[PDB]
Design a protein around this ligand. Structure first.
Ligand SMILES: Nc1nc2c(ncn2[C@@H]2O[C@H](COP(=O)(O)OP(=O)(O)O)[C@@H](O)[C@H]2O)c(=O)[nH]1
Length: 328
C-alpha cells in the first residue's frame, strides 16, 4: 500500500487512546510480546536510537505503550496526554512513562490496558508503530500481586486475540524456543502462524556448540512471516553507555562473522527488522483497512440504536465517528 497508512492508523490510535481504548477496536497494528527480559525494550530503543524506556527490576511498565515512530526532519517526542509539550530530553520521556504507570496502577501494582501514546519524530526512523505490552512472568516477586502473571497475560490477550493484530513475538536465543512465552501466546491465537513475526534476541549469548540457525531459517518452528535475529546491547554495554550506533555496527559484524548466520546476514539485524516491519505493517494496514472501516461502522450504528455506562458509550460513539472521519 501507501506511505500514508501507518500515520493514518496513528491517528486512529490517538482517537481511541483519548478515551482510553485500543484493544477492543481491532486496529491493524503490531503488538510486541515476550517474556520479561526477552529484549523487547532493547529492540524499541534500538529503533529510536536513544534510551527512553523505564529500566530496573520487576514489572516496570504496566500499560500498553503505543509507540509511534514517525520519520521527520526534526527529532522530538510527544505524549498524547501531554498536549503541546515537545520532549527533547528522552530522559524526561522515560520519567513521563514511569509517571503514567504509577498514576493508573501504582496502588494495586496491577496491569491496565489503557494505552500510553508516545510519538517519536526523527530523521533516523522509518514510519513504524508498535504497541509494546508488558512482558510475561511466572512467579510474583516482592510487592507484585499473586496474580501478576495472569494480569499481564490476560491484558496482552486482549490485544493479540484480535485478528488484525500482528504479533511481534520476541524470544531470546539463549533459551529453548519451545519455552517461549511469546511464541506460546502466538500459537494460541495464531495457530497457523500467519500474523506472527519472530524476533530472536541475544544471539550473542548462545551456548558454545549451539546456534539458532534452524530457528532463523524458519525450520524449527515455521512462521509464514519468518524470524529476524537481532543482537542488542548487553547489560554491561547499557551500563557503560555504549552508543546505539556502535551497537548496530557490532550487530552487523556479528551476523557477517558467525559461521551459522553469515549466509542469512542480510535478512538479520535491527535495520532489516525495522524495514521488514515497516513493510509488513504498511501492507497489513492496506489489506485490513477496508474491513476495519466496516467493523467500526457496525460498532457505531450498534451504539447509536442502543443509545436510543452510557457515558463510556457516548465517548466511544464520538471516537468511532472520529475514526471513520479519519478513514474517510
Ligand atoms: N547480550 C545481549 N543482551 C541483551 C540483548 N537484548 C537484551 N539484552 C539484555 O537483556 C536484558 C533485558 O533486556 P530488555 O530489552 O530490558 O528486556 P525486556 O524486559 O523484554 O524489555 C538487559 O539486561 C539487556 O541489556 C542481546 O541481544 N544481547
Amino acid at each position: 500500500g501507501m506511505e500514508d497508512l501507518i500515520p493514518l492508523v496513528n491517528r486512529l490510535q490517538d482517537a481511541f487512546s483519548a478515551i482510553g481504548q485500543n484493544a477492543d477496536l481491532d486496529l491493524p497494528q503490531i503488538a510486541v510480546v515476550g517474556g520479561q527480559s526477552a529484549g523487547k525494550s532493547s529492540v524499541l530503543e534500538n529503533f529510536v536510537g536513544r534510551d527512553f524506556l523505564p529500566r530496573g527490576s520487576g514489572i516496570v511498565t504496566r500499560r500498553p505503550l503505543v509507540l509511534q515512530l514517525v520519520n521527520a526532519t526534526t527529532e522530538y517526542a510527544e505524549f498524547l496526554h501531554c498536549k503541546g509539550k515537545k520532549f527533547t530530553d528522552f530522559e524526561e520521556v522515560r520519567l513521563e512513562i514511569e509517571a503514567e504507570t504509577d498514576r493508573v496502577t501504582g496502588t494495586n501494582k496491577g496491569i491496565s490496558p489503557v494505552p500510553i501514546n508516545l510519538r517519536v519524530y526523527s530523521p533516523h526512523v522509518l514510519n513504524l508503530t508498535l504497541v509494546d505490552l508488558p512482558g510475561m512472568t511466572k512467579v510474583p516477586v516482592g510487592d507484585q500481586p499473586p496474580d501478576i502473571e495472569f494480569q499481564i497475560r490476560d491484558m496482552l490477550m486482549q490485544f493479540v486475540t484480535k485478528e488484525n493484530c500482528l504479533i511481534l513475538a520476541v524470544s531470546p536465543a539463549n533459551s529453548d524456543l519451545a519455552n517461549s512465552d511469546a511464541l506460546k501466546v502466538a500459537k494460541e491465537v495464531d495457530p497457523q502462524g500467519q500474523r506472527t513475526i519472530g524476533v530472536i534476541t541475544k544471539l550473542d549469548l548462545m551456548d558454545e556448540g549451539t546456534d539458532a540457525r534452524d530457528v532463523l531459517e524458519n525450520k524449527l518452528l515455521p512462521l509464514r512471516r519468518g524470524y529476524i535475529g537481532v543482537v542488542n546491547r548487553s547489560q554491561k554495554d547499557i551500563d557503560g553507555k555504549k552508543d546505539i550506533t556502535a551497537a548496530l555496527a557490532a550487530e552487523r559484524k556479528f551476523f557477517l562473522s558467525h559461521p551459522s548466520y553469515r549466509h542469512l546476514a542480510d535478512r538479520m539485524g535491527t535495520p532489516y527488522l525495522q524495514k521488514v516491519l515497516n513493510q509488513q505493517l504498511t501492507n497489513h494496514i492496506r489489506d485490513t483497512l477496508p474491513g476495519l472501516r466496516n467493523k467500526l461502522q457496525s460498532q457505531l450504528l450498534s451504539i447509536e440504536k442502543e443509545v436510543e455506562r452510557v457515558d463510556e458509550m457516548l465517548r466511544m460513539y464520538h471516537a468511532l465517528k472520529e475514526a471513520l472521519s479519519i478513514i474517510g
